[PDB]
Write a protein that binds this ligand. Sequence first.
Ligand SMILES: CCOc1ccc2cc(-c3cc(CN4CCNCC4)cc4n[nH]c(N)c34)ccc2c1
Ligand SMILES: [Ca+2]
Ligand SMILES: [Ca+2]
Ligand SMILES: [Ca+2]
Ligand SMILES: [Ca+2]
Length: 466
Amino acid sequence: KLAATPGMFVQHSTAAFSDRYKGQRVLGKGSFGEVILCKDKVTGQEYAVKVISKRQKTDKELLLKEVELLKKLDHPNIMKLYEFFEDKGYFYLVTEVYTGGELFDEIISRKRFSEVDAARIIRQVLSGITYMHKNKIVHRDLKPENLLLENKRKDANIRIIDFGLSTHFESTKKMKDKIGTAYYIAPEVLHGTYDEKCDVWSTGVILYILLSGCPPFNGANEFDILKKVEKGKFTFDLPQWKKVSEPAKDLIRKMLAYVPTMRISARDALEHEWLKTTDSIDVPSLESTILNIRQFQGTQKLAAAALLYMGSKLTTNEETVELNKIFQRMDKNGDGQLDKQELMEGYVELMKLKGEDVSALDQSAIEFEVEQVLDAVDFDKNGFIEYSEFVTVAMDRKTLLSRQRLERAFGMFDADGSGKISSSELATIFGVSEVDSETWRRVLAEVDRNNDGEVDFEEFRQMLLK
Ligand SMILES: CCOc1ccc2cc(-c3cc(CN4CCNCC4)cc4n[nH]c(N)c34)ccc2c1
Ligand SMILES: [Ca+2]
Ligand SMILES: [Ca+2]
Ligand SMILES: [Ca+2]
Ligand SMILES: [Ca+2]
């Protein structure tokens, strides 16, 4: 099968950025260029663009890689990328926008954080990196400056950003490059031999700060701090720690363990007692979402692409707040995936809610029933349901299928503007040279009403609307 993934939709456009976007204001300025809030000139929808001035050939490939990395990441606590434009003088990297600002500013405002708030935040950050490390990718510059809150809501969701220092790592070899930020750098990075557990240390520093308001490793200036850091000794001796629970500190000790091999992993960090620190969902919304997932029947690739496009790229965060809640609770381990058992327990948990008797359950029947949902829903055939996949399938088709979303999807697909989606255009969407004669055949056979060899906007409409 041609594997449907959110990242395939992000392509090198050669349309003029200016033709479709207008700048609203500066969000931040770098050495590279600036990050600019932009609006789609036609829909008014807002995005954040990272604009990079050119100077020659070395610069580009290094970037193409930051992009490719970001395409492969499809996770609720990781930055979402929509597309990228290149100019004679510039690169534009268009992406979703998180308007809540840097967790850094929230820490300078709020000063301290509740055990509840901190746990939710660190759990999310850890889920993001657990996923990353599962994909053999290490972030390497984690800090509150590089964590954005989605919006100005009180308990806003977190996004990890700025993968410009991130890289692939192999468990065979070790990394040597010194990369990170003073307060948050792991001692092995200074030493020159490191692996993914540097990210754990960084996040461990973050946690310490969230709870107490101060960094665990301090000093008068950068060099001083790096000396302190490198010796690794830290204290819970400040008065503010008296009012934090022991389990939180236990987690921190394990995350700031000096010796990397004795340091807890991201994956195991998620399972710590403290991280379930909490303080519900309406049954109707849960019921509908479950019913939508059960009723999703697999389909030809063109529909699968279209739906995934609309779900993964064209829904907003505000639309998916309900869905986001349900997903996170069905993800018992927090790893950013729904697996077979988590799905099965979702159904069971719903059954408890409904008064349906548990013992009654035919475990084998349910298992088979879950296997088939996963088969239908798992767009990329990786055996697991990612966030985007979930949203696509679990949102009420009439809502996701708003008239605007449909029309915009079709326009994206009909790349040559001919009013009709060709097999080559379908190949283009997947990121593949051409489509299997058989898979294209499987499409027309179900969708091509005129019988003119392509899918026009009305044929497209029927296709999803059934
Ligand atoms: C290869 C493409 O990489 C990209 C593309 C776009 C990006 C945009 C921002 C961005 C930046 C800022 C402002 N930041 C300046 C840098 N320090 C963090 C604050 C706020 C944002 N809200 N929503 C955003 N998306 C913001 C940050 C990193 C990005 C990386
Ligand atoms: Ca999971
Ligand atoms: Ca999947
Ligand atoms: Ca066409
Ligand atoms: Ca046709």
